[PDB]
Amino acid sequence: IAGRIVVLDPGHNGANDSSINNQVPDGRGGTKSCQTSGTATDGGYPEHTFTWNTVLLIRQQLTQLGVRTAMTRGDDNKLGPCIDKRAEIENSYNPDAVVSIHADGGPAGGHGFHVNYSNPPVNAVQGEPTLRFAKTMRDSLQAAGLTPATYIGTGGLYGRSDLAGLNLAQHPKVLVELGNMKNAQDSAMMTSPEGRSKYAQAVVQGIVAYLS
Ligand SMILES: [Zn+2]
Numbered sequence: 455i456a457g458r459i460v461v462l463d464p465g466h467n468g469a470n471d472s473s474i475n476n477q478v479p480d481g482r483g484g485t486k487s488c489q490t491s492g493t494a495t496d497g498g499y500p501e502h503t504f505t506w507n508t509v510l511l512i513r514q515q516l517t518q519l520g521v522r523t524a525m526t527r528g529d530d531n532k533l534g535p536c537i538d539k540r541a542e543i544e545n546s547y548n549p550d551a552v553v554s555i556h557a558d559g560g561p562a563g564g565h566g567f568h569v570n571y572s573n574p575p576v577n578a579v580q581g582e583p584t585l586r587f588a589k590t591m592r593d594s595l596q597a598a599g600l601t602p603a604t605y606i607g608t609g610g611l612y613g614r615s616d617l618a619g620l621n622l623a624q625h626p627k628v629l630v631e632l633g634n635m636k637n638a639q640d641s642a643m644m645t646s647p648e649g650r651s652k653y654a655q656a657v658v659q660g661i662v663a664y665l666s
């Protein structure tokens with residue numbers, strides 16, 4: 455585990471302007487908006503702040519394990535990089551694994567996590583190396599006591615073709631939606647410092663399980 459390289463992507467920007475509406479190539483024949491604002495709990499806790507703070511905790515734990523780390527943004531209050539640029543930044547580190555951290559907006563009674571991965575793969579690394587990462591991450595999150603999403607995906611897994619950040623990956627990568635910000639139980643855990651710590655520990659267990 456020590457000496458491996460992991461890049462962490464806290465989804466969305468600390469702040470936005472109309473540049474986020476400019477269209478960028480999506481890695482699968484189309485274009486998508488440079489960025490989207492992301493969601494928030496009904497208490498006003500923004501997705502971008504949740505992902506930022508959870509990624510900081512993931513990074514700290516990985517560094518303590520001797521894992522070399524990088525992030526795709528440096529703050530939670532200014533414009534951050536577009537989704538295609540984030541994939542470029544990730545790829546530039548030749549990482550052994552990449553984890554993007556998001557939280558979702560779904561029906562209020564729906565809760566739990568889902569691990570998004572590229573399907574169908576557009577290159578070889580997005581095949582077995584990435585599917586194994588996705589299944590391993592799902593297994594580790596559920597073993598940590600997290601609930602697979604009750605409202606989307608299949609048993610905590612979601613293969614999809616619409617996400618530029620997944621389509622553009624040259625290294626094993628997953629995008630973990632940790633929960634539904636619009637749900638009472640997930641919002642409480644996302645808004646809790648110790649909830650964010652538990653999310654981060656579980657993601658780290660998935661990274662460790664995959665790299666081993
Ligand atoms: Zn998001």
